[PDB]
Amino acid sequence: NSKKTQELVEKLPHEVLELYKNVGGEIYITDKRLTQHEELDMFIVSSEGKSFPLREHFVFAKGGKEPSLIIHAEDYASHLSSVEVYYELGKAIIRDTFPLNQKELGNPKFINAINEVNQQKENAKADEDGRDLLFGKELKKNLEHGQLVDLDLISGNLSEFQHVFAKSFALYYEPHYKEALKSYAPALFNYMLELDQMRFKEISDDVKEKNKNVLDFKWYTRKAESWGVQTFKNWKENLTISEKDIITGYTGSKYDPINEYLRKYDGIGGDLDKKSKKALEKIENQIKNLDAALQKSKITENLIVYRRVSELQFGKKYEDYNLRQNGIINEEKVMELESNFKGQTFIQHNYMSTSLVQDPHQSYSNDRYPILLEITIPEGVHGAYIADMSEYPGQYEMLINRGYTFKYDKFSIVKPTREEDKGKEYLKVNLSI
């Protein structure tokens, strides 16, 4: 039954499912094999460390920009089956759901609990029950009993601690496993108890509160796209052919000359040859058209947009500055940037192309660019969602009008907490209009 399967998930607290729903997370129930689902060679590992081909298993959390939890409809009276579904849901929270997937495993509460489990005693003989219950094979071979876990060990072995979180989650919510968690790993039972009783709601309420002040899609494309297309549909339907053509052209070969023109003259009696004059006049007509287009479009809400950049963001004098070496962000160099640039401004003479989602493209994001600009655009700024008209699909472009001034507000170092960071830290710089 699909209901029997639905009922099973609906047992999980509302707050966990709201957190997933907020990032466009979706839950699918299916009578077909998982690999025949439209959302989806691969192998999975169950809560007890058994490997199965994906096509043979009955539950899978698909991660990434559009998270999905795919569940094969089974009876689910069996607790051995039910617990795997809560386990994958646990992974979808700790791995795929902001803010837990960036912040929770580095939390003191998680690290305190996990250490307390790695230190249980039966001079008392060492007790391995907690380890046996919750830690995977590769973790136990890399972490011995009584060995201290720190932020560093967690960051190098992320999927191993995601599993420990997910399995704690699963044993806690599955009623016939809860008592074994309590008995054999009390510190981690208590950790999950506090999340279930208040802290999931506390995290969820803080997310709803932030959503009241500012619209931020992060790296989640499902909700971003729908909002871009619908909120700028009317504007786009009122573009002329010329306006639409030059918007498209700006995402292609017409970009460099327009940007060079605007940067050169910041937004006499000699004459120019025929060809240089014709080319200059075409460019001017392009700018007239982009200007006219974007003047018709006002952003209706405070909105966050994103832009990946190199150290050349901060001028020619930051050429070979090497902010990042071997994926570690240089803490001393970031303090020099903060000192020189925080609360300072710059004028953006060209239009400002940004992304409605953080890092929509892997070749043009974290491994190539050590700086993310997180840019707050207040309501009333002129700009528009142009992704549909781009020559480079999949980029979720928000085109902001030229000639605004931007301020540097905050400089934060970000640890690799997602497989999609590729192991490399980065500097996040907040800017505002």
Curated annotation (Swiss-Prot):
Entry annotated with the keyword Transmembrane: no
Protein localization: Secreted
Residue span(s) of domain TR mART core: 213-433
GO terms (BP aspect): symbiont-mediated killing of host cell
Main enzyme class: transferase
A molecular function (GO) term: nucleotidyltransferase activity
A GO cellular component annotation in the UniProt record: extracellular region
Entry EC number(s): 2.4.2.-
Domain of life of the organism encoding this protein: Bacteria
Domain (ATLF-like): residue spans on this chain: 1-197
Main subcellular location: secreted
InterPro entries: ADP-ribosyltransferase, Anthrax_toxin_lethal/edema, Anthrax_toxin_lethal/edema_N/C, ATLF-like_dom, MetalloPept_cat_dom_sf
Chain positions recorded as NAD(+) binding sites: 251-263, 307-310, 348-350, 364, 397
Key words, A-Z: Glycosyltransferase, NAD, Nucleotide-binding, Nucleotidyltransferase, Plasmid, Secreted, Toxin, Transferase, Virulence
Enzyme active site: 307, 353, 364, 397
Residue ranges of the TM segments: none
Residues spanning the signal sequence: none
Mutation effect (residue 397 to A): Restores 15% growth in yeast
Pfam families cross-referenced by the UniProt entry: ADPrib_exo_Tox (PF03496), ATLF (PF07737)
Function: A probable mono(ADP-ribosyl)transferase; it is not known which residue is targeted for ADP-ribosylation. Upon expression in yeast cells causes cell death.
Protein name: Putative ADP-ribosyltransferase Certhrax
Organism name: Bacillus cereus
